Ligand binder design. Sequence first.
Ligand code: HEM
Length: 153
Amino acid sequence: VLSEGEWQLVLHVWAKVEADVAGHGQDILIRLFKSHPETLEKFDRFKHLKTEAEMKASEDLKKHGVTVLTALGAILKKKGHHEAELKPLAQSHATKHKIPIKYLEFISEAIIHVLHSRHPGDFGADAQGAMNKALELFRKDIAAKYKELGYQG
Ligand code: HEM
């Protein structure tokens, strides 16, 4: 599992993300969309935005970045005991949104990059390793639920 010490590192960085969720979630989604254009085609509501400027300008995109980080936050503060939060998310993303497990790996890279941009002194190699472990556990448990449903990535 993650140690209690690695959970400390994780949550101490997330409490700073919580100071500007809407700004963090907007950077993250933007980085996802640009590095991996195919993910944007998953979103009928966003599929019109072609440039970075248009993305930055959208209130609705910012609303959805708040949705995602809040749900991730709920999960991270359960330190592993996240079965009840995670189960509905796997079901919707499997059966309704149809999101490949690989795209969950892409947004995981985006979160880590943005956390490093916005919080260097605070997000050293050690906190980087703890956060990547916590995201892998997230991916790992959703992937198990996908397999059960017949979607396995
Ligand atoms: C940490 C990653 C993610 C979290 C915590 C997360 C969380 C959520 C939540 C809470 C919702 C709204 C309720 C739901 O539909 O069940 C949602 C909706 C959605 N998510 Fe995810 N999501 C994540 C990653 C992704 C990725 C990587 C994609 C696409 C590449 C994606 C695409 C969508 C779409 C299409 C919706 C619905 C948007 C709309 O209202 O039309 N999600 N997600």
